[PDB]
Amino acid sequence: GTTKHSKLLILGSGPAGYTAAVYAARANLQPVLITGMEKGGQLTTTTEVENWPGDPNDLTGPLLMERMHEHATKFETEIIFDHINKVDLQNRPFRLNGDNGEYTCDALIIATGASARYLGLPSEEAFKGRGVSACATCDGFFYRNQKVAVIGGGNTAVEEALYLSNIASEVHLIHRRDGFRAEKILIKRLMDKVENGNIILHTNRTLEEVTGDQMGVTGVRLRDTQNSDNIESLDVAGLFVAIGHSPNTAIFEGQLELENGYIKVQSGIHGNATQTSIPGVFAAGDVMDHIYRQAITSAGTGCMAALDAERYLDGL
Amino acid sequence: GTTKHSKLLILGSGPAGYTAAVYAARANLQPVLITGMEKGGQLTTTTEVENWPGDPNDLTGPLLMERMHEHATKFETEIIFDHINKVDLQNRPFRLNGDNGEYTCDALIIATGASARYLGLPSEEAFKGRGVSACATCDGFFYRNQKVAVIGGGNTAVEEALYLSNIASEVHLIHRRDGFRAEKILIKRLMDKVENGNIILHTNRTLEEVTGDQMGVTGVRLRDTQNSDNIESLDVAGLFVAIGHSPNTAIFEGQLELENGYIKVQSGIHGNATQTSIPGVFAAGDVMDHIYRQAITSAGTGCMAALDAERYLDGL
Numbered sequence: 021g022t023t024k025h026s027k028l029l030i031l032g033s034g035p036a037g038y039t040a041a042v043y044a045a046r047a048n049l050q051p052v053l054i055t056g057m058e059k060g061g062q063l064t065t066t067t068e069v070e071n072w073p074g075d076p077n078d079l080t081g082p083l084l085m086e087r088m089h090e091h092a093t094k095f096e097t098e099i100i101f102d103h104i105n106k107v108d109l110q111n112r113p114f115r116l117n118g119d120n121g122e123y124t125c126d127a128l129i130i131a132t133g134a135s136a137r138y139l140g141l142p143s144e145e146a147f148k149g150r151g152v153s154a155c156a157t158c159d160g161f162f163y164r165n166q167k168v169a170v171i172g173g174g175n176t177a178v179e180e181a182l183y184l185s186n187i188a189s190e191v192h193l194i195h196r197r198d199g200f201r202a203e204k205i206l207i208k209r210l211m212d213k214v215e216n217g218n219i220i221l222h223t224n225r226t227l228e229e230v231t232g233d234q235m236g237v238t239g240v241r242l243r244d245t246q247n248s249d250n251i252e253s254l255d256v257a258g259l260f261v262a263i264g265h266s267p268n269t270a271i272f273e274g275q276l277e278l279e280n281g282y283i284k285v286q287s288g289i290h291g292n293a294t295q296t297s298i299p300g301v302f303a304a305g306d307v308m309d310h311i312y313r314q315a316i317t318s319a320g321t322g323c324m325a326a327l328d329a330e331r332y333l334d335g336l
Numbered sequence: 337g338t339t340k341h342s343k344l345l346i347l348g349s350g351p352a353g354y355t356a357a358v359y360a361a362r363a364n365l366q367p368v369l370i371t372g373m374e375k376g377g378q379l380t381t382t383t384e385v386e387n388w389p390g391d392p393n394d395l396t397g398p399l400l401m402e403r404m405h406e407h408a409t410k411f412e413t414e415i416i417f418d419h420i421n422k423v424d425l426q427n428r429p430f431r432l433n434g435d436n437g438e439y440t441c442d443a444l445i446i447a448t449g450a451s452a453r454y455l456g457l458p459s460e461e462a463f464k465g466r467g468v469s470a471c472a473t474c475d476g477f478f479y480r481n482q483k484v485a486v487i488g489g490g491n492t493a494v495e496e497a498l499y500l501s502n503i504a505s506e507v508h509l510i511h512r513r514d515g516f517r518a519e520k521i522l523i524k525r526l527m528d529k530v531e532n533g534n535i536i537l538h539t540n541r542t543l544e545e546v547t548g549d550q551m552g553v554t555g556v557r558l559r560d561t562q563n564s565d566n567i568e569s570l571d572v573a574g575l576f577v578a579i580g581h582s583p584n585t586a587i588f589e590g591q592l593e594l595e596n597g598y599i600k601v602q603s604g605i606h607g608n609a610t611q612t613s614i615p616g617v618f619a620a621g622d623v624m625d626h627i628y629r630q631a632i633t634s635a636g637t638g639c640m641a642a643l644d645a646e647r648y649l650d651g652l
């Protein structure tokens with residue numbers, strides 16, 4: 021059973037992980053990065069990306085990540101194809117257990133992500149990348165002035181609808197319940213846009229199927245009500261599934277301070293912003309950000325973690 | 337005298353400004369961006385950039401910014417060539433005074449930057465981009481295993497030397513004073529690396545000239561001591577000028593909360609992180625970051641500001 025030790029170990033091969041790698045590599049820290057199951061993170065599950073600063077045209081999640089990876093390898097970053105299933109961050113050096121073996125480190129950067137949960141329907145699965153999306157901020161502008169649907173029943177859903185109501189010509193919010201479980205402000209604003217605006221509520225409804233053509237989503241089928249099989253079809257260009265995300269932090273339960281599954285970082289404006297509750301352990305990307313959730317913000321925090329780790333490893 | 341009004345106004349055409357523009361543009365906020373004197377920010381004053389995530393090869397500050405600008409224009413961002421010389425953020429809408437006219441806005445994003453101050457020497461000026469640099473994190477790896485010099489006498493200088501001492505084969509810290517005015521920890525660590533390490537102190541010295549060849553810096557000339565013209569030449573591959581930066585915040589004095597010239601933002605992990613002391617005014621990039629100072633971090637905060645402004649303008 022192998023036990024490998026590196027000064028700096030990075031977890032995750034998405035934007036956050038790779039950027040942390042290039043900054044640590046160009047800092048001469050000889051970083052080791054564990055890719056995780058999904059090599060490339062969430063971006064590999066997407067098509068066109070037109071909000072990455074500097075790439076106005078022809079970019080895709082896969083292409084961006086391929087470039088990220090190449091950049092990381094150019095600086096001799098040691099890429100290990102594994103996935104951590106257990107850790108002990110209460111002892112030095114830190115110990116992480118994977119499938120290919122165990123790893124130890126003096127400084128750790130967690131960039132494991134927080135992927136979105138979907139409905140699990142076959143039709144929905146068929147339209148992913150071609151109409152079905154999980155991030156309004158990412159694909160919303162594609163549906164500028166077109167009818168759009170958002171399905172969910174909490175803050176995440178209402179937030180998506182609110183953000184889409186200034187971009188789409190219409191926003192159809194769908195939920196199985198009669199009401200939405202979101203914070204009072206969002207509910208008031210949502211109702212303002214409903215009472216006299218861009219939003220059309222579809223409560224007590226279940227998404228039976230996502231329909232469309234060779235180009236993308238063209239409709240969505242809803243049913244249910246109350247003791248009646250009342251069905252209604254909606255013409256829609258896009259479906260934003262907003263039922264929630266799953267921060268990859270199970271392995272960290274009882275080890276780090278978490279907030280709704282997210283790793284809590286020091287944040288602030290005085291340095292050591294990616295620091296977790298444990299001196300020497302840092303977090304970047306989605307796993308520690310539930311507000312912006314962008315590749316650029318993820319790469320920014322990835323950069324910060326590498327620099328924080330550097331200063332930490334240098335006793336500063 | 338013209339008074340133009342836009343829902344959202346962005347100040348600065350560096351990474352932070354442009355990224356904020358693409359995120360606001362793709363948010364359908366129809367942003368107006370005032371470029372400032374230096375169109376493109378600090379990156380235009382540089383050559384090779386190999387720490388921008390996704391661009392392992394052939395990138396330059398100018399090329400990155402040209403791409404940033406094109407991305408911003410692709411989404412119909414209104415670019416105005418001006419520079420703000422006065423503002424009033426205590427009234428709504430906000431009022432900013434330029435040279436081409438006055439501007440008003442419902443939400444403002446400040447991404448004015450914080451450029452580095454140099455020594456002002458003719459030789460130094462001659463070697464900028466070819467040996468003389470102002471950011472270790474940016475150009476340090478270029479001098480991996482080579483002799484390097486850093487000139488300054490405070491935290492910024494010592495920090496640069498410390499960061500370079502794990503990358504360069506030698507680090508020559510130069511200052512006109514006998515000691516360094518930095519925080520105790522940095523001084524202890526600096527002395528550890530001096531007593532038994534990578535750093536060679538050159539106190540009570542003045543940089544008389546930066547010398548080099550068609551490829552770059554090859555040396556640096558020092559003089560002074562104490563009542564004696566004692567001169568000493570040093571073979572060095574790079575000179576990092578670390579005497580300080582100048583946050584472009586004069587116009588904001590008495591208007592916003594500042595910290596050593598930097599605009600204080602709310603920060604945190606619960607959203608509205610780029611918010612300044614004034615509801616509706618946001619800051620991104622160098623002007624609000626004196627720790628990382630990277631294009632990627634600047635673009636990240638630029639992204640956040642646009643999203644914070646969006647949520648603000650939407651009454652959330």
Ligand SMILES: Cc1cc2nc3c(=O)[nH]c(=O)nc-3n(C[C@H](O)[C@H](O)[C@H](O)COP(=O)(O)OP(=O)(O)OC[C@H]3O[C@@H](n4cnc5c(N)ncnc54)[C@H](O)[C@@H]3O)c2cc1C
Nearest residue numbers: 032033034035036056057058061062104132133305306315
């Ligand atoms: C539909 C959709 C489209 C998108 N397109 C865009 C877009 O246009 N623009 C944009 O800015 N963003 C886009 N995103 C990406 C998104 O913004 C993410 O927030 C971003 O990828 C997060 O980066 P990350 O590095 O933090 O995490 P992730 O990309 O999620 O990567 C996490 C990495 O860590 C690994 N990992 C997980 N658990 C472990 C473990 N235990 N051990 C080791 N490794 C582990 C994973 O395998 C993976 O490599 C899109 C997202 C969605 C939902």
Ligand SMILES: Cc1cc2nc3c(=O)[nH]c(=O)nc-3n(C[C@H](O)[C@H](O)[C@H](O)COP(=O)(O)OP(=O)(O)OC[C@H]3O[C@@H](n4cnc5c(N)ncnc54)[C@H](O)[C@@H]3O)c2cc1C
Nearest residue numbers: 348349350351352372373374377378420448449621622631
């Ligand atoms: C020697 C050197 C080399 C560099 N190369 C790299 C590199 O390889 N990698 C990297 O990550 N970073 C590099 N940088 C850039 C640096 O990291 C900066 O921190 C980055 O450019 C900051 O982005 P910004 O958008 O906040 O500000 P800036 O780029 O400084 O831009 C500020 C903008 O706002 C404008 N402005 C200022 N005042 C006003 C006003 N009153 N009204 C209107 N507009 C105004 C300016 O004209 C300018 O357009 C380098 C820096 C230096 C010192």
